[PDB]
Amino acid sequence: MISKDEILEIFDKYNKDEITIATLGSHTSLHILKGAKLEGFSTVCITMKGRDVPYKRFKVADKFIYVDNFSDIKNEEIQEKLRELNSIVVPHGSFIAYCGLDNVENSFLVPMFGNRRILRWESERSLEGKLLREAGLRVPKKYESPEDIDGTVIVKFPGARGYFIASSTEEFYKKAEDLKKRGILTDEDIANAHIEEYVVGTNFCIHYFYSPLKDEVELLGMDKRYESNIDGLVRIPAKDQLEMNINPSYVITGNIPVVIRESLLPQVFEMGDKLVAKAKELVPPGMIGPFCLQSLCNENLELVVFEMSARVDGGTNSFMNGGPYSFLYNGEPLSMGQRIAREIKMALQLDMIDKIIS
Amino acid sequence: MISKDEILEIFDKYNKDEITIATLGSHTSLHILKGAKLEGFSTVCITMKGRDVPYKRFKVADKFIYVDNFSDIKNEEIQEKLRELNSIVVPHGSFIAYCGLDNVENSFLVPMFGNRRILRWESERSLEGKLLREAGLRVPKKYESPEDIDGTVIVKFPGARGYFIASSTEEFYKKAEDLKKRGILTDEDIANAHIEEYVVGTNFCIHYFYSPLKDEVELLGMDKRYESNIDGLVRIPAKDQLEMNINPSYVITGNIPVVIRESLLPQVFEMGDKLVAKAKELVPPGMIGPFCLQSLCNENLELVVFEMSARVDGGTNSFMNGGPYSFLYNGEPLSMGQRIAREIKMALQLDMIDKIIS
Amino acid sequence: MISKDEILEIFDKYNKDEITIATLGSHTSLHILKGAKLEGFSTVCITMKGRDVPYKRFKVADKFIYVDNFSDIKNEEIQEKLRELNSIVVPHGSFIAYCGLDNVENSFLVPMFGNRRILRWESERSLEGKLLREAGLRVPKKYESPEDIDGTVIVKFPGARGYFIASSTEEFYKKAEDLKKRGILTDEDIANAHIEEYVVGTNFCIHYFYSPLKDEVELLGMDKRYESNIDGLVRIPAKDQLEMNINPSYVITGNIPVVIRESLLPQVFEMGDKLVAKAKELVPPGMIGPFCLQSLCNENLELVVFEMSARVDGGTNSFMNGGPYSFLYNGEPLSMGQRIAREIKMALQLDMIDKIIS
Amino acid sequence: MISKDEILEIFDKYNKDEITIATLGSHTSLHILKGAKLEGFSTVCITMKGRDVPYKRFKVADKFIYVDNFSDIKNEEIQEKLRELNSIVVPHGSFIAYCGLDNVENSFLVPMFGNRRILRWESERSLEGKLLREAGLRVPKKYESPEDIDGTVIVKFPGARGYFIASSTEEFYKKAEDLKKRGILTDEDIANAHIEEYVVGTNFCIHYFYSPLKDEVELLGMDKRYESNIDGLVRIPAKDQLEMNINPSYVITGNIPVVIRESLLPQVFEMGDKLVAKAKELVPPGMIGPFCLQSLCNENLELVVFEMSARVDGGTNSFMNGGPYSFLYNGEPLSMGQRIAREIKMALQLDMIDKIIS
Numbered sequence A, B, C, D: 001m002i003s004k005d006e007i008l009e010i011f012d013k014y015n016k017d018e019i020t021i022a023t024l025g026s027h028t029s030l031h032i033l034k035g036a037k038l039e040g041f042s043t044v045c046i047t048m049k050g051r052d053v054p055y056k057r058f059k060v061a062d063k064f065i066y067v068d069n070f071s072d073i074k075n076e077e078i079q080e081k082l083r084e085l086n087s088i089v090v091p092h093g094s095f096i097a098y099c100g101l102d103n104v105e106n107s108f109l110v111p112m113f114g115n116r117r118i119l120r121w122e123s124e125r126s127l128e129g130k131l132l133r134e135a136g137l138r139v140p141k142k143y144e145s146p147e148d149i150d151g152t153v154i155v156k157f158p159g160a161r162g163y164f165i166a167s168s169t170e171e172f173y174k175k176a177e178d179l180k181k182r183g184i185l186t187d188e189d190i191a192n193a194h195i196e197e198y199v200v201g202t203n204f205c206i207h208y209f210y211s212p213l214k215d216e217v218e219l220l221g222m223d224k225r226y227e228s229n230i231d232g233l234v235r236i237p238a239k240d241q242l243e244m245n246i247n248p249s250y251v252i253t254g255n256i257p258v259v260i261r262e263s264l265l266p267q268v269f270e271m272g273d274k275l276v277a278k279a280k281e282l283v284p285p286g287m288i289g290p291f292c293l294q295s296l297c298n299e300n301l302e303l304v305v306f307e308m309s310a311r312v313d314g315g316t317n318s319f320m321n322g323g324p325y326s327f328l329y330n331g332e333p334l335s336m337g338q339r340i341a342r343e344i345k346m347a348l349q350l351d352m353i354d355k356i357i358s
């Protein structure tokens, strides 16, 4: 389990005049890297043949560390190149996945922006729910078993895409079976089934930034998810949908910008404030930098959080050129990637790097 | 009924070197206030405990006038603080509502950007329709009674959310009853029922600005509404929707940016030109500053206006950092809030304040 | 058939110090013209009474060539005004249509940005499919006859809006007949019927720019289409849709910005690279400047191209003030219109005009 | 004598995705490095303890190559670090001096922006005069010996500061002797004495840029020299100067911005055009990038060139934030350093690196 001192004392051997920002070339790296450049940093992008073109043509990376496959980023060899470049790593979804979250927590000896420990509170549904519940945030009702279904529910399986909607116990088994005989779910997944209230409302994935330097939760932007096949499915007229044998899937393919009704911003900020206050208690020092509440706004104007991330969320890509909210601070086209880099910049200049790395 | 002279002569006692822009902290105030700052104004934000965080963290307000509840903004005490700060008030939805439109028309003795009189032509469906019809704009067919229904209609009740769709007289009563026994509509609302043609098409809420200084209608931007539960409802596959007992509601929760097919801009501009030419005749001096046509584009490329506002519409929040249309004028990230402030700026500099306040 | 030399030698008689950019006032002209101005060009806009207001109020045109009807832009009289203004014409959908594609290929003697020959590879479904197939891009399955239908298909008629969805041979004829007796399709259209796999997924219209100066395919932005009545139709709850007798139409009314999942950008770039490499072989010099792949992302994260353009696509209007992708290059609000003008600028400065005009 | 192929083939082994700009930390490096960063390059600054603070605090250097003394920059060890960083070196006064011009011409195996050969045409008074005379530029009259003095002359010695003014042969020896007995000049310097017409007029050091990509001479800015003790000496009232025993020295200490009378710009441009046309003939490929004519404007509005440089002149420091002339191109705060970096940028993108390096 990587210690702080184990990290601070690695950063102490860094050339503090040549500190770079590094990340894996995927997920949200385009504005992580662009944002870094805009803040005056030189940037390092871990990449591989076949997947490096976007980073070359957008010209956001000063140095490339090529790997055979992204799984190699855990390798001690890459950790060394990174340390020799004085890189502070900015973590994201793809990086945690390809590196392996366990390798991240105790085998990845490179300074990393954010709270290293809290990355597993986002990966485990039990910890997430604990956090969200204890922070006092609205979540969907959970159902222990298919027999408890008394309304419309969504059912999630960590399997192969692993989703269906049900309005009764009977329907639950009809659909589970369908997906089983169709070769998408095994009985192991069917037992793992997570059943929750289906919330009917508008999607707001809210992107926050907690600055430990300023001790302030900031609102940076919002997106709604664009998912396949579901957003294609519901674009088929009902009469034709009824003639089809098609199951909804919810694969993230993209994002669409959205802004919320302004009278709801006090709720939005309170939600971020609460998450932050509680996460300080449960996982010190708490949330560091970017975090996302993925919510649904019901007809009673209550935001229900069905998901959260403890680092930068893919939806930040929707405002790489700045957004309506990020503009208000200083009238600039500020991305989340640039807001991260600036926190790193300040921290270095104020000699408070210990507030933002681990 | 607040006179012009009653207002001009209050503005004459203003320190013309220290003129501020004020508004209530809600609805569209973020870019009203940010836009003001960007134009060099000091800004005043009426706010209250529990609802002030967004305005503090986005740093758009130089001075805060705190109230116990937003209903107090009609109070003579707040009118005085505002007058002592040399504030020109920028009105919007939440402000007119919390102040009370009657208090606005004859009890609110603070200079106000726009045409004070015309604020009630947006609040009364009879005046709106009169205006839109007389301006020569396409509107949905109206139906006098449930018995006149010969197609799909939408039905609106000023009640508690108060909407349903019907394709027959019989269906109208089936649904009215459902909502009655469900405790959403009383027979008073059911009689008040407004029935109109359901227009099937794409939503464009078009944001215009009429400059009385330039005598020109400008196009600033467009959004589509993001409403709950309807936009959540239609995201459920048809087969599952049929298994649910759920009524559509249309609560505004947010906005999504959109641009229109360019060949349709002459229609768009003609619509704004017509609204303006007629409103000059019907309510002198007519439209002043921001106004919105909320339209649906049918398959015949005709924009049908189902609603309008005579001040700044919430949808302007979608381009607080500028939009595709607002950019064209000077290549700037121009919000509606900033366009309002600039009109105020010019007016002061050209000594033509009488063209924009009342 | 307009020769290159026939064009180069017309451009040689041009005052190379006074080169302007011209286009017809429609489709995408707002940012074509604005982009030109931003790059230092004087701009020419072909327009007509009743349709000139947007170009006057947005102030993007320095000179107006008025016509009686846009059909007159083929007239030798307009070709001369254009040549006397040293105009390089930027072609787009509306221009090719109003001028007539045949008049464009051999009767329009004005220098034109792009590959003149390739404009008809976008107009003919046989050439398009050839190109896309030979480039190795995923396309929807084609069906030779209604009898071959073994899934859900979409059916396209070049007629009056000319679309329907079918899941069986029987349904195909039920619907064809409906549209026939309804006066939308004649038996000539019904024979012309193009049947293809209905792809269920998320719409990404991807806007690329191939720079022959840099020999590089660039990603500029993405939109999703906003079509009527379909996007209005599917916003009606299923229960109400079933009570209606309504056919879906797919008239382009507007666009909504979207960004793609970042891990998919290597696929996105590969697709543009492949299209470009093949079009060089099939229609020398190949793609010049703006081109669009109109795709659907299925649940397997495969982009299926159902359409393409070989010039600037209307969807570029969604980022006239720049977009998340166009920002990354130099942190600027770069439109496609401005990217076109810059290529023209460079070409002139480097004396490589022969790489971009025809 | 470093060959082109010897350099091109070293640059061919460069990672063309990671090309940096390098220079020695002095002379004009601040805007060479800042300009590079602004164009998207990562920057390398050769520096040493005691002289690195300005480059650290202005944050213009991403990587530092420390040396013991600047004389070490000729060392094969530094040439290697530079080659491993894919650095293109931007040469300037201090760099040529500390490296040694002979080491530069045939011992410095790093790609270098500009025409390597022509660096010695600026170092030798005979070549300079040849060039300037053959280009057809006005220069001060030369005098072969003190006996030829028939007016006011300035006398230059390459010695220890080594200057005096004389109006007669007698005065020449009076002053030479004074400086000899004072320990500033030895008889070797006194024989080396260069005597030329003293031009009475206004100093314009004109900074040009020849773009081989565009084949165009550009005007970037102008400064006047600020020299000690002379500019301090002449600030003493005449009556007091006569009471002092003080000799004028002309040590460059700084620069002051100046703009020229606009009617003189055709002369200014013609001078740069002529220098460039001739230097192409005399030293192929001629002038590459920045060059300076150091001139005096006599009362007849004729610019007399008393000096020139074939690379970037220290006076460019006066417009590191852009100047009145550099602004006109694109309304940007363009330094010479940034104009150099942009030429490098373009060259790489257009695959024309062979036009700018040697």
Ligand SMILES: Nc1ncnc2c1ncn2[C@@H]1O[C@H](COP(=O)(O)OP(=O)(O)CP(=O)(O)O)[C@@H](O)[C@H]1O
Residues within 6 Å of the ligand: A140, A154, A156, A196, A197, A198, A199, A200, A225, A227, A250, A252, A296, A306, A307
């Ligand atoms: N309680 C709920 N009610 C209604 N819809 C829900 C829901 N929970 C999830 N969804 C829909 O299903 C999608 C997938 O939800 P999930 O909880 O799997 O998010 P996620 O972000 O963890 C999946 P991934 O990480 O693969 O993007 C959501 O984006 C949302 O559109």
Ligand SMILES: Nc1ncnc2c1ncn2[C@@H]1O[C@H](COP(=O)(O)OP(=O)(O)CP(=O)(O)O)[C@@H](O)[C@H]1O
Residues within 6 Å of the ligand: B140, B154, B156, B196, B197, B198, B199, B200, B225, B227, B250, B252, B296, B306, B307
């Ligand atoms: N004639 C019509 N046809 C189809 N849809 C309609 C319609 N009139 C309204 N709608 C839908 O119902 C929603 C509510 O319409 P309404 O006329 O109540 O607008 P509004 O702006 O006055 C309500 P609020 O002020 O609460 O936002 C609209 O945003 C639109 O989506």
Ligand SMILES: Nc1ncnc2c1ncn2[C@@H]1O[C@H](COP(=O)(O)OP(=O)(O)CP(=O)(O)O)[C@@H](O)[C@H]1O
Residues within 6 Å of the ligand: C140, C154, C156, C196, C197, C198, C199, C200, C225, C227, C250, C252, C296, C306, C307
């Ligand atoms: N294979 C397919 N599967 C699913 N939907 C499809 C499809 N092909 C087309 N569509 C839908 O139908 C619309 C019209 O498609 P079409 O192929 O006519 O594009 P287009 O751009 O040539 C028509 P226009 O030129 O008039 O805009 C598309 O925008 C898409 O929404």
Ligand SMILES: Nc1ncnc2c1ncn2[C@@H]1O[C@H](COP(=O)(O)OP(=O)(O)CP(=O)(O)O)[C@@H](O)[C@H]1O
Residues within 6 Å of the ligand: D140, D154, D156, D196, D197, D198, D199, D200, D225, D227, D250, D252, D296, D306, D307
């Ligand atoms: N012919 C002339 N008439 C009048 N003044 C002259 C002159 N030649 C030079 N000077 C003055 O003497 C100064 C030094 O001139 P010099 O010819 O040594 O330039 P330089 O740039 O080669 C010296 P350094 O390289 O040390 O700056 C000039 O900057 C100018 O002010």
Ligand SMILES: NC(=O)c1ncn([C@@H]2O[C@H](COP(=O)(O)O)[C@@H](O)[C@H]2O)c1N
Residues within 6 Å of the ligand: A026, A027, A093, A094, A097, A252, A253, A254, A255, A313, A314, A315, A317, C260, C261, C262, C263, C264
């Ligand atoms: N664009 C997005 O919203 C997004 N993109 C990726 N992700 C999440 O990040 C994870 C890794 O992304 P990728 O599979 O593209 O490498 C995915 O499993 C997904 O949960 C997102 N939420």
Ligand SMILES: NC(=O)c1ncn([C@@H]2O[C@H](COP(=O)(O)O)[C@@H](O)[C@H]2O)c1N
Residues within 6 Å of the ligand: A260, A261, A262, A263, A264, B026, B027, B093, B094, B097, B252, B253, B254, B255, B313, B314, B315, B317
């Ligand atoms: N974001 C919006 O479009 C929006 N936000 C608010 N409004 C209108 O302004 C009125 C007051 O807003 P609020 O209820 O958020 O204080 C609301 O009733 C609604 O009609 C909107 N149209």
Ligand SMILES: NC(=O)c1ncn([C@@H]2O[C@H](COP(=O)(O)O)[C@@H](O)[C@H]2O)c1N
Residues within 6 Å of the ligand: B260, B261, B262, B263, B264, C026, C027, C093, C094, C097, C252, C253, C254, C255, C313, C314, C315, C317
């Ligand atoms: N906004 C758009 O996407 C768009 N606007 C126009 N078009 C295409 O250009 C053609 C010409 O446009 P217009 O009919 O607006 O003159 C249309 O038939 C359509 O295919 C588009 N794709």
Ligand SMILES: NC(=O)c1ncn([C@@H]2O[C@H](COP(=O)(O)O)[C@@H](O)[C@H]2O)c1N
Residues within 6 Å of the ligand: D026, D027, D093, D094, D097, D252, D253, D254, D255, D313, D314, D315, D317
């Ligand atoms: N600021 C200037 O004009 C300037 N600074 C330096 N130089 C020239 O560059 C040569 C090297 O500069 P330095 O001595 O500062 O290292 C000096 O001998 C001088 O001729 C200048 N012309």
Ligand SMILES: [Cl-]
Residues within 6 Å of the ligand: A206, A207, A208, A290, A291, A292, A311, A312, A313, A316, A336
């Ligand atoms: Cl985030």
Ligand SMILES: [Cl-]
Residues within 6 Å of the ligand: A093, A309, A312, A313, A314, A315
């Ligand atoms: Cl994510």
Ligand SMILES: [Cl-]
Residues within 6 Å of the ligand: B206, B207, B208, B290, B291, B292, B311, B312, B313, B316, B336
């Ligand atoms: Cl508005």
Ligand SMILES: [Cl-]
Residues within 6 Å of the ligand: B093, B309, B312, B313, B314, B315
């Ligand atoms: Cl509103």
Ligand SMILES: [Cl-]
Residues within 6 Å of the ligand: C206, C207, C208, C290, C291, C292, C311, C312, C313, C316, C336
């Ligand atoms: Cl395009």
Ligand SMILES: [Cl-]
Residues within 6 Å of the ligand: C093, C309, C312, C313, C314, C315
């Ligand atoms: Cl198009």
Ligand SMILES: [Cl-]
Residues within 6 Å of the ligand: D206, D207, D208, D290, D291, D292, D311, D312, D313, D316, D336
């Ligand atoms: Cl120079």
Ligand SMILES: [Cl-]
Residues within 6 Å of the ligand: D093, D309, D312, D313, D314, D315
């Ligand atoms: Cl110099």
